[PDB]
Design a binder for this molecule. Sequence first.
Ligand SMILES: CNC(=O)[C@@H](NC(=O)[C@@H]1CN(C(=O)c2cnn(Cc3ccccc3)c2)CC12CN(C(=O)[C@H]1CC1(C)C)C2)[C@@H](C)OCCC1CCCCC1
Lengths: 294, 270
Amino acid sequence: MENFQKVEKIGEGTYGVVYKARNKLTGEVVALKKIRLDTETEGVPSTAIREISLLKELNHPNIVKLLDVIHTENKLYLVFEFLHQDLKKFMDASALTGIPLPLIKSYLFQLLQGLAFCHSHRVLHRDLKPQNLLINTEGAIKLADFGLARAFGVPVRTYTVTLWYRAPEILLGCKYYSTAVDIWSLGCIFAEMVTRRALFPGDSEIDQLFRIFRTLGTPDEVVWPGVTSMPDYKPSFPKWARQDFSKVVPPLDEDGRSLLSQMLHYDPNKRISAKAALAHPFFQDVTKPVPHLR
Amino acid sequence: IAPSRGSPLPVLSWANREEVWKIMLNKEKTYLRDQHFLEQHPLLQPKMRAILLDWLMEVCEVYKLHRETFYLAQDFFDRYMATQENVVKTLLQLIGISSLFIAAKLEEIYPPKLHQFAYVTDGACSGDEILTMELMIMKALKWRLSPLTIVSWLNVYMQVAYLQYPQQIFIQIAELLDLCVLDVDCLEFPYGILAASALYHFSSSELMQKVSGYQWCDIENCVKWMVPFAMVIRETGSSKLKHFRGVADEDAHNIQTHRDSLDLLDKARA
Ligand SMILES: CNC(=O)[C@@H](NC(=O)[C@@H]1CN(C(=O)c2cnn(Cc3ccccc3)c2)CC12CN(C(=O)[C@H]1CC1(C)C)C2)[C@@H](C)OCCC1CCCCC1
C-alpha cells in the first residue's frame, strides 16, 4: 500500500470504507475497498471471499475489474479499477436535459452484454440498480457490486434486492430466484434512463406490487400461469388495466417499447433472456449477427 | 483436453449453451490437480489425507453442510498442498478445517461460526489459527476459489439426464465418489472424468456419454481404476437417502453424509 495515495472517501459498506486512490508512481487511479480484519469476528467476510473469487473468474469489458487483493498488517485491500461515477448520478445530472437516445441504447446494449456473460457463467447478479452500474468518460458502462451474486448450479432460494428493482415473482413469494430477476431490473433501469424517473418507486412490498400492477395491469392466469397460486397472491388485489407504453415511455420508438415490454413480461418463464435481448431489432443499428455453423 | 468430448447440454433459454459449456470446460485449465503432490511432503503418507478428508466429511454431516462445501474443501486442500512443501502431520487438521471454513463461507447461506469450526477440533485448533490459515490458503491459491468440483459435475450430469428415484441414485453415485476421493490417486483423472466414471458404474456407457459428452475411450482408464471401489460399494448395498431437519426434501440429496469409508478403502485397495 506504499505506492497508493488516498484521494477521497467515495463509499462505505458493512465490510469497509471505499476510497478513490492514486498510484503515486504510475498515476493510475483505483477504488480501494479497505477491510479492517481486526473487527471481523469471522475472518475475511464471506461476501468478500465470494466477490473476489467471482471477479477473478468473470473477465469481461462490461464487468468492473478487480485489479488486486493486498493483505497488509491486519487489513485486506481490494483494488478495483476506478470509474468516475455510477448510473444514478449520471441520470440525476442528466434529468433536465435528458440522456441522448443513442447513449441510452449503447448503455443498455453493454449492460445486456455483461449480464449475458454472467448468465453464461451460471451467475445471478441479483442487485442490478443504477448505483451498481458504473460509467467512464469514454462511453462504457460496467456491472459492479457483485456482493449479492450467487451461482445457480442448483436453485438459488429466496430468504426473508432493493425494492424499486425487485421482480414481481419475488414480491409474490416465489421460492427461488432466476435469471429473469436480473432482466427485470435492467428493464426498470431502461425505463428510468428514458423518463429520468424510477419506474416503480414503491415504499413497501405491497406498494411496490400495486405500482407494478397499475402500470403493467393486474396479472391473471392467462398472462402469468400460476399467479393465483403464489404464496402472497391475494384475490382481493385491485384490478388495474395495463397502460399503453406510449404513455409510460413516450420518447421510445416501437422497437424500444417492444424490448421494454419483453423485459418486463410478468411470466418469468417468458421474460426475454439477456442473449435474446441483444438480438432484438432495437439493437440492429448497434450490432449485426455472425454466420451460424450447423 | 478431451478433443473427443461432445457437448451434452440441451438448448437453454437463459444463455448460449455453447458458451455455458465452454466456460465449464475452461475450469480444468485453471484448476489443476497433482496426484503426486504428497512427494513434496516426504513426512506425509497418502493415508493421512484419506483420514483427514474422511473426518471433514463427518464434520460436514454433523453441521448438515452441502456436498459442494465438502468438495470445495477437498479441492482447496489438494491445490494448496501442491503449492507447499515439507508439511508435517500435526498441521493437517488446521489446513483441513480452514479449507472447510473457507468453503462453508462461500457455499452455505448461514455457515457455522468460526468458534464452531474450532470446537470440532477438540481443543487442537484455535479460532485465531484458523483465521491465519484461511488467509495463507486463499493467498497461495491466488484467490481462485471457484473450481467445478467433482460433485458439481455429478449435478450437471444428473440435470442433463433429467432435462428409480433420481435423488437416491444421486446419493449412491455421490457415495462412490466420496470413497474414491479418499485415495490421492484419484487426482490422476479430471474431476469431470471421475464423476462420469462413477455415474457409469451405476448406469451405462450410453447414458454416461449422453449426459457427459465423454466417449467410452475417455473414461476407460478411470473406470478400470475405479472398479475395486465400485465393487466394495456394490457388495454392501448402497445407502438410502435421508431426511435432515431444517433441510427441504428437494435439497436433501445435496447434504453431505458420512459412512465407514476408511474400512471400505482398505478392502478396495487390497
Ligand atoms: C433440484 N432441482 C434442480 O437442481 C433443477 N436444477 C436447475 O434447474 C438448475 C438450476 N437452475 C437455476 O436455478 C436457474 C436460474 N435461472 N434459470 C433460468 C430460468 C429463467 C426463468 C424462469 C425459470 C428459470 C434457471 C437452472 C439449472 C439447470 N442448469 C444448467 O446449467 C443446465 C445446463 C444443464 C442441463 C446443466 C442449472 C433441476 C433441473 O435439476 C434436476 C433435479 C435433480 C437432479 C438429479 C438428482 C435430484 C435433483
